[PDB]
Amino acid sequence: ASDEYTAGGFITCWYQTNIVVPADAQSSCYIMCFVSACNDFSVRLLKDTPFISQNSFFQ
Amino acid sequence: KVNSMEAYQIPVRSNEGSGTQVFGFPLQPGYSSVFSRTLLGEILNYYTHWSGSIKLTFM
Amino acid sequence: GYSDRVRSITLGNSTITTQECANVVVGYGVWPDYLKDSEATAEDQPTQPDVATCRFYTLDSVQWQKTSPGWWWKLPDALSNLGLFGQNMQYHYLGRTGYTIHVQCNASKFHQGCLLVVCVPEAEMGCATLDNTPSSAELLGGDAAKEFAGEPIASGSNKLVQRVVYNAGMGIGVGNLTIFPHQWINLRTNNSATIVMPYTNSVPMDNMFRHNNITLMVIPFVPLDYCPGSTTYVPITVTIAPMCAEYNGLRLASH
Amino acid sequence: GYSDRVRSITLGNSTITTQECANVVVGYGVWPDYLKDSEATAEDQPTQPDVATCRFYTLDSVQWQKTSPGWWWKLPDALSNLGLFGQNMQYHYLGRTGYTIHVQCNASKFHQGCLLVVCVPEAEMGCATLDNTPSSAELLGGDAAKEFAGEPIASGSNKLVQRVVYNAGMGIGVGNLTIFPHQWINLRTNNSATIVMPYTNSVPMDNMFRHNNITLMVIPFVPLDYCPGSTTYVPITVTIAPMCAEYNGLRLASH
Amino acid sequence: RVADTVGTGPTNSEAIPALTAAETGHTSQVVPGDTMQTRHVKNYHSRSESTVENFLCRSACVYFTEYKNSGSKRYAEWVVTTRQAAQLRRKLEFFTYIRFDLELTFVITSTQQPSTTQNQDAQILTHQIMYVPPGGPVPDKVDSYVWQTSTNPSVFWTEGNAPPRMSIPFLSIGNAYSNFYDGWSEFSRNGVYGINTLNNMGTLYARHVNTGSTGPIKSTIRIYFKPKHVKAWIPRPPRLCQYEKAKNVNFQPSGVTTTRQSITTMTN
Amino acid sequence: RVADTVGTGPTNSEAIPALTAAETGHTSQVVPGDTMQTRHVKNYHSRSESTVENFLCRSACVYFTEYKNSGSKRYAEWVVTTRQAAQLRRKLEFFTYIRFDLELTFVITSTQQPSTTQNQDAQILTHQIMYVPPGGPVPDKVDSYVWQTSTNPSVFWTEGNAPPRMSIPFLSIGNAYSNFYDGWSEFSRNGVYGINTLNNMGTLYARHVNTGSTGPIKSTIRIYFKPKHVKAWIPRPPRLCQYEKAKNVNFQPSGVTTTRQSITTMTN
Amino acid sequence: GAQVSTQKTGAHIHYTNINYYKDAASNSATRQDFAQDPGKFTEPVKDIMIKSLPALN
Amino acid sequence: GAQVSTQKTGAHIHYTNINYYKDAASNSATRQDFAQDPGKFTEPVKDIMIKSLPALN
Numbered sequence A: 001a002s003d004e005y006t007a008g009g010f011i012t013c014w015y016q017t018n019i020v021v022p023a024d025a026q027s028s029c030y031i032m033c034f035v036s037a038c039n040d041f042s043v044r045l046l047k048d049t050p051f052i053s054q055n056s057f058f059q
Numbered sequence B: 001k002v003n004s005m006e007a008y009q010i011p012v013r014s015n016e017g018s019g020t021q022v023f024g025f026p027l028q029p030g031y032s033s034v035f036s037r038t039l040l041g042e043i044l045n046y047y048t049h050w051s052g053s054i055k056l057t058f059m
Numbered sequence C, D: 001g002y003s004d005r006v007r008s009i010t011l012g013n014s015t016i017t018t019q020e021c022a023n024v025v026v027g028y029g030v031w032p033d034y035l036k037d038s039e040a041t042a043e044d045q046p047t048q049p050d051v052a053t054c055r056f057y058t059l060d061s062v063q064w065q066k067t068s069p070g071w072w073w074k075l076p077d078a079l080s081n082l083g084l085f086g087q088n089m090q091y092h093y094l095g096r097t098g099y100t101i102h103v104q105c106n107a108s109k110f111h112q113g114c115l116l117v118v119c120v121p122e123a124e125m126g127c128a129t130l131d132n133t134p135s136s137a138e139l140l141g142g143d144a145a146k147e148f149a150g151e152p153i154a155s156g157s158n159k160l161v162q163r164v165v166y167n168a169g170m171g172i173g174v175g176n177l178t179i180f181p182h183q184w185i186n187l188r189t190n191n192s193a194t195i196v197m198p199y200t201n202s203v204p205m206d207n208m209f210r211h212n213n214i215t216l217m218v219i220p221f222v223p224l225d226y227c228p229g230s231t232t233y234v235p236i237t238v239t240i241a242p243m244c245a246e247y248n249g250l251r252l253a254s255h
Numbered sequence E, F: 001r002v003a004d005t006v007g008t009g010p011t012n013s014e015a016i017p018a019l020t021a022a023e024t025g026h027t028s029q030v031v032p033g034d035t036m037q038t039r040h041v042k043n044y045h046s047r048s049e050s051t052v053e054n055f056l057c058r059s060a061c062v063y064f065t066e067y068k069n070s071g072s073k074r075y076a077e078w079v080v081t082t083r084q085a086a087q088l089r090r091k092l093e094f095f096t097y098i099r100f101d102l103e104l105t106f107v108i109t110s111t112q113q114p115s116t117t118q119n120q121d122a123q124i125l126t127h128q129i130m131y132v133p134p135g136g137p138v139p140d141k142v143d144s145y146v147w148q149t150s151t152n153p154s155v156f157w158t159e160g161n162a163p164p165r166m167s168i169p170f171l172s173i174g175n176a177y178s179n180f181y182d183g184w185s186e187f188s189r190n191g192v193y194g195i196n197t198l199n200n201m202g203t204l205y206a207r208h209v210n211t212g213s214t215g216p217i218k219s220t221i222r223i224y225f226k227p228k229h230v231k232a233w234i235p236r237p238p239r240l241c242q243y244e245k246a247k248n249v250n251f252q253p254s255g256v257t258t259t260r261q262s263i264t265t266m267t268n
Numbered sequence G, H: 001g002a003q004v005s006t007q008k009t010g011a012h013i014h015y016t017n018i019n020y021y022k023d024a025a026s027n028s029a030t031r032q033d034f035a036q037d038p039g040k041f042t043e044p045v046k047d048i049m050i051k052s053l054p055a056l057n
C-alpha cells in the first residue's frame, strides 16, 4: 500500500539519439514491456485483496 | 485506451528533437495502476510486505 | 558450425523446415510420453499406430489485416475431420495424445507487427448473456478459425460466446495470458513459432468429443503496418501434429 | 559462440550496450591506473570515491546536417557542471583521472556518411587575429558542443578561435589527425565508437580548471546523404565516463 | 531460503547479459550484478509465507443459511458446492487442477424472533447437521425417518460450547479437483456446459432437534472450508472481472486496469 | 546474583578512592569499604525481578470500545496503536528502541440496555473479531462480504467460556519497534511529524454474529497487550509530564519536583 | 512414538508432535515444505540459453 | 522431547517444559536470563580509570 515513509522511486525512459527509418518504411513504432521478479523476491503478512467483491451469495 | 489492445503498446516515433521523454511511472507494484493488474501485482496484492529486485524486459 | 535460427522437424511422413525460427518451447518441461502401466485404469489393450495418427496436418489459413482482433482453435475438434486421427478418435471411446503446434506468418523487412501464440489448457469461455451458456456451434469451429471482437458482445439473450479480445473470453486480463507456454512472432525477427504441449488433464484418458483440453490462441498485440507499395495480404497458417497418440474402447462409429 | 560486434560496458551504476560496434581502442596501450607511490609528489592523502566520480555521464546531443563541419569538446570542462565529478573537481586543487569516450550516431541502411572521433591531447588553438589569444568563453563550452566553420574566420581584431575545419584550429593538416587514438563511425557498418584515454600529462597531478588535457573532436569527412523519404534529423550523442579519479588539496569552493 | 547477491566490479566485455531475445518465450534471469556494480549482501529472508499450503490454508466462509424452530422453513438444504463466495473462489481459480483435503467448522447462531406469545421459557437448542451423498434419501420434511442417519455422517451440537469441526478426505472419482471443464455432459455436445458438469458432491441438511420454547427462534448456520495437504497444478492468470453466477464463468467485460492522467504521470 | 561486600580494616594511604573527577562523565564505583570499615556480609539477594522481560511482561489494557446488537453503531473500528493508555505507554517510553512479540487477550462483556420491548428471550451472543492489515478492505457496514475473512485472521467467541487469546510475532519492516522518530514523512520536511510516521499496523474490527434478542444489548470489548521475548536498546529518561495527545509527545510544562518547606526540612 | 521437529524462528527450540487419529487424513497441515523448481515456468525452452550469450546467433 | 530446567526458589525441584506449537513465536516467556553488563552506561570512558587514583593527574 502507499506510504511516503517507504517511497519506491521513479522509472523513466528517454530518447537517446533518435529513431531513423529508410524510405517507404513506417516512422511510428511501438514498444512492449514485461515485469518480473528477481531470484531474491519475498512477500509476508497475508491479507485480503481489495479487488474482488460480492453484493450477495452468487446463485 | 484501457478498453482495447492499445493499453499494452508504448508509442515511439521519429522526432525532430532529442532528449524528450517516452514514458515514466513510480515503483509501486502493489498500488500504482500500472502494476496493479500484472501477475506480479496480482500476487503482491495478497501480501502486505514485499522485498527484492525487479526485471523490466523491453521489446 | 551452424546457427540456432535453422530447424527441421520430421514426424511420420511429414517435414517442417524453418530458417528464421526461435527456440522451441517444450510445454512445462515434459516431453509427451505413452501411458505407463502404473497409471492406467482401462483394462483393455490400447491401439497405437504412431504413423498415420502422428503427422503434420495443415489447417486453413486466415488473413491478418490491420484491424484483426485474434483467433482461437480447439486442438481435438480442429483435427476431428482430417485423416485417420479423425477416423480413430471417432471410432473409439477414450483417447490420449500430446500436440506439436507450428504457426507460420512471414513478412518482409519493411513490415511490422507482433503475435502472441499461447496454448491455454481447459479454456472455459463465458457466454454473452449471464443466464445462457455458449452453444456447440459457436464455441468450436471444425477446421475453422473463430475470430474475436474488438468491442463487447451484446448482452441480449443469445448463445453467442463473449468474444471481446481484451478479456480473452475467459474473463481474465489478456496481459496475464503469459503464464501458459507461449511464443512471440515479431515480423522484425521471428517468422515461425513452435510449441510442444504434453497431455494435460485430470484423468488418465478422456473422451475427445465432449472435452477439448487445449485451446490455441493467437493475439496480435502490436497491429500490422506498412506503407503503400508492399503486399497487403499477409496470411497466417497453423500446422498441428499429434504425438504419442493411443486409444481404447472400440465402439460403433459415432458422430 | 558469440560475435565481436556486440559489447557491454558497466561502470559505477551505469551500463552501455552496443550491437553494431567495432573493436575498442585503448589509448596508447595503457589502461588507466591509480598513481603509484614511487611517482607522487603531494604528501597529502588522496580521496578516491570511484563510484560517484566514475560513471557514464551523457552530454547534450547535436544534429548532423548535410553541411555540418564538425564539433569539439573539452573533457575536464564538459563534466565540470554534472554530478559529484563537477562538485569534487570544484572543491579540490589537484585532480587526476582517465576517460572513456562513447559516441552514438545511428542510421538506417539507406543513409551514408563517415565520422572521425579523435582524442587530441593538449590541443592549443590559434586565435583569428595574430595579436590576440582566444578567450575562455569562446574556446570551451560547458556541456555544449562548439561547432567549426567551413570557411576561414575573419582576421579583424577579436578573441574568436580560428574555427576553420581543414586546419582543425591548431594549424595542422586535418588529414594527419590520425596519429592520435581515433575511431571511424561509417553509417554503412559502425553505429558507435569507443575510446579509452589514459591520463596523459607532463606532471603527476594538475588543476582541472586552468588546464584541459584532452579535446575530443568529431569531424564528418564524408557528408551525410539520403533520398527524400528518410528521416532527416540524425543526432549525435557523446557519453563520457571518468576512470580511476582521485584528488588532493581540499580547499573552499572555487568557481 | 532467498538467494543472496554476489559482489561485482567494473567490466568491459563483448558478451552482454542485458541484451536477449524475448521472442523465444524465455525469462532472462539477470542478477542486479549484470547491469551495475553490487556489494555482497547476504539475504536471511525466507519464502515460507508464499508456499501454496500457507496461502490456501486459512478458514473461509463458503455459504450461510437460516432455519426456524416453528414456521414454514423448519430445515435448511444446501448443495455442497464452492463458487458461492468470491474471496475463496478467486483464490482457488489461480490453479486449473487442485487436490486438497478439507476441514469443516459450523458456526451456528440463534436469535429470538419478534412475536406476541407471553410466558417464554427458553431452553438449550440442539442442532443436527446431516450430509447426504449423491443418491441417498432426502428429508422432504423436518420430521422424517431419513434423520435416523443409519449410514450418513451427522453431528449433534448443543448451544453454549465450542463449535463443531470435522475432517474430510479427498472425495473425487478423478485424480484431482478440476476447477475448469471445457466440455459438455452429453457426447452429443448439447446439455449442461462448463464446470457444473463435475459438481456431484452431495447435499447438507440441518435442523433443530428440539423446539426451544413457545416463542419463534431463528437460527443461522455458517460453513467454513479449510484446505489441508494441498497440491496445485497448471498455474492460471487471476480473475480480474467480478463473478456473476455460481454455475459458470459468465461475466461482463471490464477495462484492463484503472486509468491515469497521461503516459508520464507519477500519480494515480 | 547481587554482589557481596568485602571486610576492610583501618587504612592510612595517599591513594584516595572517594576523591575523583565527575567532569569525565564516569560513575565512580565505590564499595562502602572505601569510606568506612565494613564486615564480610554475604548477599543471597537476586536481581531476578528487575530484568526487562519481567518488568514489561504483564498484561495491560490498551483500549476499550462499545458496539450494539441493534442500533446506529453495530460494529466497532480501532486503528491498532499504543500511546492511548498512560500506564503501558510510560513503561514502553523508557527505551528508545524496543523489539518484542505480543500476546492479545480480548475481554468481551455484554449488558442489557433499558427499553420498553416486552417478551424478551436472551440467547448466547457470539462475537467475531477481525484484523485488517494496512491495505485490505474495510467493512463499511456491519453486514458486508469483507466479514468472510478468506485471508485475514479472525476469532469467533461465544459468551460464557474462557476469553480469547492469540500470539503475534514481531511485525515491522525495520529491525525494531521505534518509539521516537524525529523526522517527517516527506523529504520536503513538510507533512506528518513525529512517531505517527511509523504507525501503519492495521485496524481491528468487531461485531455481533447473531442478534441476541428483541431488546437492545450493548457489548464492550477490552484489548490486552502482553510483550514476550522483549529486547530493549538505548535507555531513556522517564516521562515526568502527563500525556496530552496520542499522535505525538506534545505536553504542558510542569515543575521538576514537588516542593518542601526549606533546604534543611526532613519532611515533605 | 512421538515426532520431534524444529520450529520456524527468526535468523541471525524443538517441538513435539504426536498423531492420535488413525485415518491419516486428520493430521495437522504440513506447513514446512520449502521446496521450489522455477525451471518449468521460467526458461522452459528446449535448448539451453546461457545468460551472457547472443540469444539468436 | 521434553526440556527439564531448574525452578526459581529461595536461597540458604526441576520442572518440565514441552513445546506444542510449531511457530517458535508461541513459546512461553523466557524469564530466566539474569545477565548484565553495566560497562556501557557507567564508566564508559575510553581510557581506563582505576578507582584509587587521581582521576586527573
Ligand SMILES: CCCCCCCCCCCCCCCC(=O)O
Binding pocket: E080, E081, E082, E102, E104, E129, E130, E131, E153, E154, E155, E166, E168, E171, E177, E201, E204
Ligand atoms: C456433518 C457433515 C459432515 C460431512 C460434510 C461434508 C461436506 C463436504 C464434502 C466434500 C466437499 C469437497 C469440496 C468439493 C468442491 C470443490 O472441490 O470445488
Ligand SMILES: CCCCCCCCCCCCCCCC(=O)O
Binding pocket: F080, F081, F082, F102, F104, F129, F130, F131, F153, F154, F155, F166, F168, F171, F177, F201, F204
Ligand atoms: C483476531 C485478530 C488477531 C490479530 C490482531 C493483531 C493486532 C496487533 C498487531 C501487532 C501490533 C504490535 C504493536 C505495534 C505498536 C508498537 O509496537 O508500538
